[PDB]
Amino acid sequence: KVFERCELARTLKRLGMDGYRGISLANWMCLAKWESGYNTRATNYNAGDRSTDYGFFQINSRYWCNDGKTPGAVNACHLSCSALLQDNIADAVACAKRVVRDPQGIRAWVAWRNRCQNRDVRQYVQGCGV
C-alpha cells in the first residue's frame, strides 16, 4: 500500500507515534518518506551482511525481524519480516517503537541522519491537521 502523506500522518498519530520518546510526528514522516516513499511493500537487500530491509520504515532483518534467511539474525521485534510488508501498519509501528527504545534512538536509520536530522521537516505534516 502506498499511503498518501496526511493519511499516514493521521494513522501514525492514532498509534501513538507523535512525540514517542521525544520523536516528533514530522520526523517519523521524514524517515518514512526517504525510506520508502510511503510504500509498505518496499524492500532493499544488503549484500554486505546478507540482510534485507522491509516496509515503509525499512526495518532490517539482521536485528529486528526474522525473514529466515539472514545469518546471525536476532528477532528483537519478535515478528516475521513478512508482517512488515502488510497494508496494516500496526506491527511496523510497534517494531519501530522498539528500534527507538535503544540508546541510539532514531539515529539507527542512516537516511534519517542524512535527510532529516537538524533540518526543517515541517513540510511533512503541514496541512494534515495533526
Curated annotation (Swiss-Prot):
Question: What's in the GO CC field?
Answer: azurophil granule lumen; extracellular exosome; extracellular region; extracellular space; specific granule lumen; tertiary granule lumen
Give the main localization category.
secreted
What enzyme category does the UniProt record give? hydrolase
Question: Which transformation does this protein catalyse, written as a reaction?
Answer: Hydrolysis of (1->4)-beta-linkages between N-acetylmuramic acid and N-acetyl-D-glucosamine residues in a peptidoglycan and between N-acetyl-D-glucosamine residues in chitodextrins
List GO BP terms, alphabetically: antimicrobial humoral response; defense response to bacterium; defense response to Gram-negative bacterium; defense response to Gram-positive bacterium; inflammatory response; killing of cells of another organism
Any one Gene Ontology molecular-function term assigned to this protein's record: lysozyme activity
Q: What InterPro entries is this protein classified in?
A: Glyco_hydro_22, Glyco_hydro_22_CS, Glyco_hydro_22_lys, Lysozyme-like_dom_sf
SUPFAM superfamilies of this UniProt entry? Lysozyme-like
Disulfide bond residue pairs: 6-128, 30-116, 65-81, 77-95
What the entry lists under Pfam families is as follows: Lys (PF00062)
- Establish whether keyword Transport is in the entry: no
Q: What's its EC?
A: 3.2.1.17
Q: Which UniProt keywords apply?
A: Amyloid, Amyloidosis, Antimicrobial, Bacteriolytic enzyme, Disease variant, Disulfide bond, Glycosidase, Hydrolase, Secreted, Signal
Residue ranges of every copy of the C-type lysozyme domain listed in the record? 1-130
Cited function = Lysozymes have primarily a bacteriolytic function; those in tissues and body fluids are associated with the monocyte-macrophage system and enhance the activity of immunoagents.
Family in the record: Belongs to the glycosyl hydrolase 22 family.
Quaternary state and partners of this protein?
Monomer.
Q: What protein does this entry describe?
A: Lysozyme C
Q: What organism does the record attribute this protein to?
A: Homo sapiens
